[PDB]
Swiss-Prot record, chain C:
It comes from the Eukaryota. Component of the RNA polymerase I (Pol I), RNA polymerase II (Pol II) and RNA polymerase III (Pol III) complexes consisting of at least 13, 12 and 17 subunits, respectively. Pol I complex consists of a ten-subunit catalytic core composed of POLR1A/RPA1, POLR1B/RPA2, POLR1C/RPAC1, POLR1D/RPAC2, POLR1H/RPA12, POLR2E/RPABC1, POLR2F/RPABC2, POLR2H/RPABC3, POLR2K/RPABC4 and POLR2L/RPABC5; a mobile stalk subunit POLR1F/RPA43 protruding from the core and additional subunits homologous to general transcription factors POLR1E/RPA49 and POLR1G/RPA34. This is DNA-directed RNA polymerases I, II, and III subunit RPABC1. It comes from Bos taurus (Bovine). The lineage of its organism: Eukaryota, Metazoa, Chordata, Craniata, Vertebrata. Coiled coil: none annotated. The gene is POLR2E.
From Swiss-Prot, chain E:
The chain holds residues 246 to 392 of 1174 of the full protein. It is found in: Nucleus. Catalytic core component of RNA polymerase II (Pol II), a DNA-dependent RNA polymerase which synthesizes mRNA precursors and many functional non-coding RNAs using the four ribonucleoside triphosphates as substrates. Pol II-mediated transcription cycle proceeds through transcription initiation, transcription elongation and transcription termination stages. It comes from Bos taurus (Bovine). This is DNA-directed RNA polymerase II subunit RPB2. Belongs to the RNA polymerase beta chain family. Component of the RNA polymerase II (Pol II) core complex consisting of 12 subunits: a ten-subunit catalytic core composed of POLR2A/RPB1, POLR2B/RPB2, POLR2C/RPB3, POLR2I/RPB9, POLR2J/RPB11, POLR2E/RPABC1, POLR2F/RPABC2, POLR2H/RPABC3, POLR2K/RPABC4 and POLR2L/RPABC5 and a mobile stalk composed of two subunits POLR2D/RPB4 and POLR2G/RPB7, protruding from the core and functioning primarily in transcription initiation. Part of Pol II(G) complex, in which Pol II core associates with an additional subunit POLR2M; unlike conventional Pol II, Pol II(G) functions as a transcriptional repressor. It comes from the Eukaryota.
Swiss-Prot record, chain F:
Zn(2+) 1 binds at C9, C12, C31, C34. This is DNA-directed RNA polymerase II subunit RPB9. The keyword Metal-binding applies. The lineage of its organism: Eukaryota, Metazoa, Chordata, Craniata, Vertebrata. It comes from Bos taurus (Bovine). SMART domains: RPOL9, ZnF_C2C2.
Amino acid sequence: AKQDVIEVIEKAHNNELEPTPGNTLRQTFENQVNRILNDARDKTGSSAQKSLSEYNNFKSMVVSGAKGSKINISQVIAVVGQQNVEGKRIPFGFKHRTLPHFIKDDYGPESRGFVENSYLAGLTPTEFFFHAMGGREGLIDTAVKTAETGYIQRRLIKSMESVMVKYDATVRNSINQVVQLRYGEDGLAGESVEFQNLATLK
Amino acid sequence: RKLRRQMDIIVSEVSMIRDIREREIRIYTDAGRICRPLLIVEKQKLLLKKRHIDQLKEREYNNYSWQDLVASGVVEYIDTLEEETVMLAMTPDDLQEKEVAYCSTYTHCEIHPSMILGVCASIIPFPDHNQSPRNTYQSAMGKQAMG
Amino acid sequence: DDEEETYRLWKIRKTIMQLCHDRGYLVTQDGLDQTLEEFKAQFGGKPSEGRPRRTDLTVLVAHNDDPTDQMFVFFPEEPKVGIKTIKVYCQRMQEENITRALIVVQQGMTPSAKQSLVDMAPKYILEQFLQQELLINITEHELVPEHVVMTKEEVTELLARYKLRENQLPRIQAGDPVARYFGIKRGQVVKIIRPSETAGRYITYRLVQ
Amino acid sequence: EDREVLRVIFPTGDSKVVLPCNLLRMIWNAQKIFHINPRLPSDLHPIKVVEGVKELSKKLVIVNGDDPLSRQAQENATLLFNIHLRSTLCSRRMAEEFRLS
Amino acid sequence: GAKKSAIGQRIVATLPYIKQEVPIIIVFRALGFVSDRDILEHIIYDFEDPEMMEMVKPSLDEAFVIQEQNVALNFIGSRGAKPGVTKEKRIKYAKEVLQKEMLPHVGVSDFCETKKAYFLGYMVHRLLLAALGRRELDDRDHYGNKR
Amino acid sequence: PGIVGIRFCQECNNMLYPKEDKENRILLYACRNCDYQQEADNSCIYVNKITHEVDELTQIIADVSQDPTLPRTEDHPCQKCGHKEAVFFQSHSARAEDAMRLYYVCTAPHCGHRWTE
Amino acid sequence: HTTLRKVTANTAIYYDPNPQSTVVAEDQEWVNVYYEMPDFDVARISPWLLRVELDRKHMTDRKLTMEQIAEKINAGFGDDLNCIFNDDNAEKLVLRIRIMNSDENKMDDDVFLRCIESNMLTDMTLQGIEQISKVYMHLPQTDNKKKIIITEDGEFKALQEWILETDGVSLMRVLSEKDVDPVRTTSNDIVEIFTVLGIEAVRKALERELYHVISFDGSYVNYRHLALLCDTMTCRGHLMAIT
Ligand SMILES: [Zn+2]
Ligand SMILES: [Zn+2]
């Protein structure tokens, strides 16, 4: 993978990289490098999930859905993979380089935040820092979204609070104005329904 | 840079920045800047030799300590906006010839990579083996521990 | 060019012939379906320096129940219209004894004319249609359910069944593109028949206020 | 007539719907409770499957009324359910697949 | 508009202790440079680059009407914290603004009007580079910008 | 065409402005604060490059060759003096349109030759 | 939306005393060609020249004709402006411009001529619909955007057809244009559906948007609860924000 990223990088230095329609040459380059690196971590993930024995306990917690997902096994055994900030690969905090160690204008997989080590073998120093940059974006979202999702939850209730199914079975808000002739248009409480196929259709 | 490494006219605290493309040079004596020490690398060799480490090993009753290490030009304080003009090597390993030269120019080497962690995150064993929010939670629960 | 302006005069005429058909005015089956070349044969291709001048495009359709009622669809030739222009049209409606008529405006109506339309409620009613609002029949879009305007007999029987006052229905304001389409006036009630994925069909009633 | 209505209500032919009672489970429950042998020929008259759903569909009442406005508003409320309930209880499926006694 | 389209991009300074904005070339003439060759000599360090020349040109046409130093100080003093009753009360007021509250780190005293000229021309020079795009916009969070 | 440029008066050192001579149909430049006039040699006035294909070799500074943080290859020898070290970098320019093209700057003292491949 | 600045290479204003002067090297050829039989110069030719370049890439990309641009410029500004252009033979594609001939029959000229440029480059509107920034073209792989036809056998056949997806919306004009599908065209923006297709289309197009953000995660919320929220909002007769 890291050798196929060096070819895509070398093709763009000589201008041989042709932009995909609707995409800046920076947008087509940031896509082709993400198409390669995702296939890398998607391949090494599925190569790690073939190796697990029937007696493995991770496979026991994943297969029954009790806890964990198939993508946590990949990162433990195989590769943690690309680390993203704001949906984009790690940006340049310094001038044209990510950390003091890297050389200016290094777009290679290591410089821009791809972590090729698994939590078991342990992350190298910089991969530890980029992994910390991708986790901060998780902590922040969880702190910000809750206060928005709670101010919306309060607005939806105060506007609808008094709508109720009257004895005519017509749904009417607090004024007696008619919101619906029957509740939900079929007039059925929502807890007793199930999914079904029509089988005459199609 | 030579006068700062001998600490003659310029305290080690003054930071100096040559920005080539815009042609400026900046010298900040200002207070509040934040700077951490680094080893210096001249050519491909560290300026920290073995004779420096033997004297520090015996540091007791030598009256020979960090300030006598800084005054020999071996270590250097480098604040942030001067880290934009520097090439750092993680360890002396990166200085040796790898036959495929990433960079031959390394101008400073870091003392140890694990000094990037604070006081409450320095108590975690093997912090690089954990998902990143899990070193952040221990920072919160390391301050609440009965002891 | 003049091929586009001949094509535009083809939609506007066609879409209007669907209004008059959906409001229940007698419209022949041939006038509903016109191939452009057949339209280009009747009104002759290029409007500019050509036989259609934007006048003589006028449409006179008679209501299904009453042959006397009828209606007009007027096409002004001016980019904008003004009270002196409408007063010409209203003088024509007075001449031919009708009441209801339509106006298809190219660009917009002068702010003094819009009130002049309201100035006559009982005697004559006129409706402003921008040249674009007729370029497409919104009744045939997927989002818009079938609307049906209801007779007074059916609204009385409705409000008795559910025992509703008139103001307890949902509303559809008279400035609504599907209110203009069906020429609905404040106080009428419309019947929205739309397919649903729970009931399989549902009938909503909107009052127009 | 119902197969033409469904293709109007469900373009893209998504057949997965949410309805009040499960027919395929309850037809399947009345096979096990009554010990029906599907290898054997059924005794269930193919008319009494037809006259029984018609008499059923009248006993499912969302909207109560005798008015022509009340009749039309039930046929719409129970529309997609009576369509589903006439697919699975069809006189043929009872003779072949289910073989209910 | 008719004027906005023709002019192009005009540069303005928002000074401390002035109610509203002031054009730039008014601020250089307030500091004692009469000619436009001297004003553009501080802002644009190389005249052979026309790309910058075209950037500044529309900001000379906005300041064209005030050609004199003492007219310009009066242009400023009109906008002060309170308008001076007598004219020379305003010119005395605006000059005290340029001496003290204008860029005080360069100098507070008298002939510093030259020292304030280059550096204030350097703000206007570096604002062009980000308008032409020959440099990166400074980063709000870059931790070398912090004290 | 040319990107043109300013001209200054020789007395008050102000900005000359282009104006038309109606009698002789000859483009003139005139300061607005004096009577000074001068004949236009260039005959072009306002020129604007919208496509703005820009030559970076003009902006690049030869001093860039001293930066440790830039990469360098001995693959590409210098075109002038035939020196093996070349320190290459990208646009480093906002509003560059789309360019990943590398620009090369020759190392060794005082050569400073700057090429693009 | 294609402004004339999209296709323009560079622009320069020149001073020409007479057209046959041609301070530029190349123009002199075809300049004389049009002035062998010069027309509508009867008044006089304004000296101030505006000479713009057009990149053949962007010209051939959008299938633009120099004659087409000549029309829209002359039509937009009227007879106050004269326009002259190359054949495609020219490797460098040039469009000459001059001030009104009859204007010779305030604002100066070079100032007023630069005021025309900065108005043109933004305001020309050569093609398309203003407020439409970009339009993407792709074949959808999701069965919601795939046209699905009932064949002669009654089967559902999902067809792949090209669909466009615009950045920015003006719905009323997009629907009106030829070959664009009136029925199935839709926008996600509500208020422009309200003002165009009615309050009923908002009742449906709102429950199609809410059902998209809720079921995008793969999560599922019953249709009953979506339809009541869209009933409470639109039952007053107009869009009722929750605020
Ligand atoms: Zn002068
Ligand atoms: Zn060389």
